[PDB]
Amino acid sequence: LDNIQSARPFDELTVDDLTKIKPEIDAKVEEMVKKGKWDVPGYKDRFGNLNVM
């Protein structure tokens, strides 16, 4: 139960904190920009895009 032992500030977790704990996020975003894919695969299905139309 080490997962619950470290407590959970997901309402206030910083994206800089994720970049610090995961450079994989920074590398994936950087290569995803370099190739040009502004789409995020599998985002739209569980999270509503909230485009006007």
């Binding site: 959970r8 997901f10 309402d11 569980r46 509503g48």
Partner: protein, 51 residues
């Protein structure tokens, strides 16, 4: 001449702050609740299962 345009802009801001502001507040709060709810519940129910 432009003061009547100022007065109508005041009335426009009154209409916005009476009607559009709480509607957008409710919309943004519902979307915020959906974001925080799914983002919390998925990680919670996945981390609780931790052969």
């Amino acid at each position: 001449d432009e003061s009547i345009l100022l007065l109508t802009f005041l009335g426009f801001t009154g209409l916005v702050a009476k009607y559009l502001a709480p509607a957008y507040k409710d919309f943004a709060d519902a979307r915020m609740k959906k974001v925080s709810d799914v983002l919390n519940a998925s990680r919670n129910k996945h981390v609780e299962a931790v052969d």
